[PDB]
Design a protein around this ligand. Structure first.
Ligand SMILES: CCC(CC)c1nn(-c2ccc(F)cc2)c2nc(CCOCc3nc(-c4ccccc4)oc3C)cc(C(=O)O)c12
Lengths: 252, 10
């Protein structure tokens, strides 16, 4: 029942999921060079004169701001989360959202590129590599993570529980009631363990594999925040959205 | 307060 409630909250609150992404990825407009990036912008984000890399940077920020709002509503729907001290809810979301974001982005990624703009575009991995430093260094580690993550062949029922476990993490810095959160996480992880054994009877190590992926995600996010800081202090026109500034502020 | 706090409050 806890598993079902978490899965239903995931289906309700996230506009994109692995089934919807797989349906599309089998017709999105392909962004693979400067010309098609410009055409996609005219069609899909008509509002925006700046460098191509900074324009993509601002589209990326806007995407992340939307996903944080989806994750906040998802978290509120996790049984017990709303019983926590509000300050601890903030702390859980602050440290959890980007691990959740990069885990879920894997659902829209393949070896050649990734869905963007609510499924209406597909940006190639090579085009992103072709951008000027430091922007060409941002997505490649995320593609590397996603290739291995997708090899586990999780479905949306698995991922919903994985994301809940990421959010409900008792060892975030600055938590007031560490004990309540640890207890809440123990129940989620218990339901995830049982779910993996029923849904993936062929992979007896899937649960410890996924525990390792949450540690990999923590390190991926730490390194990503270092790129955020390199951009914020060197890039002339790369203004941070205030919500994302709040999230990155004093996080590692 | 904070933008996250606002988000958590409906
Ligand atoms: C390092 C600085 C931060 C901004 C605070 C950043 N920088 N970058 C980043 C920038 C430029 C690039 F070249 C590649 C990546 C980012 N990327 C993503 C994934 C967003 O993934 C969905 C996505 N949507 C698009 C897109 C493209 C065109 C039109 C519409 C959407 O592209 C992608 C990758 C998230 C973040 C994030 O910290 O929040 C982020």
């Amino acid at each position: 029942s806890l598993a079902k409630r978490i899965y239903e909250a995931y289906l309700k609150n996230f506009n994109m999921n692995k089934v919807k992404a797989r349906v599309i990825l089998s017709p999105p407009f392909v962004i693979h060079d400067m010309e098609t990036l410009c055409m996609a912008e005219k069609t899909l984000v008509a509002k925006l004169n700046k460098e191509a890399e900074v324009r993509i940077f601002h589209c990326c920020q806007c995407t992340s701001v939307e996903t944080v709002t989806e994750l906040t509503e998802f978290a509120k729907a996790i049984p017990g989360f709303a019983n926590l001290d509000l300050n601890d809810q903030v702390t859980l979301l602050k440290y959890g959202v980007y691990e959740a974001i990069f885990a879920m982005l894997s659902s829209v990624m393949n070896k050649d590129g990734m869905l963007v703009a609510y499924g209406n575009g597909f940006i190639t991995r090579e085009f992103l590599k072709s951008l000027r430093k430091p922007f060409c260094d941002i997505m490649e580690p995320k593609f590397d993570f996603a290739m291995k993550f997708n090899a586990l062949e999780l479905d949306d029922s698995d991922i919903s529980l994985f994301v809940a476990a990421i959010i409900c993490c008792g060892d975030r810095p600055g938590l007031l009631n560490v004990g309540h959160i640890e207890k809440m996480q123990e129940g989620i992880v218990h339901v995830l363990r049982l779910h993996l054994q029923s849904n993936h009877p062929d992979d007896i190590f899937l649960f410890p594999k996924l525990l390792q992926k949450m540690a990999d995600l923590r390190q991926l996010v730490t390194e990503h925040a270092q790129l955020v800081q390199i951009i914020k202090k060197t890039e002339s026109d790369a203004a941070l959205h205030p919500l994302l500034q709040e999230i990155y502020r004093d996080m590692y | 307060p904070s933008l996250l706090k606002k988000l958590l409050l409906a």
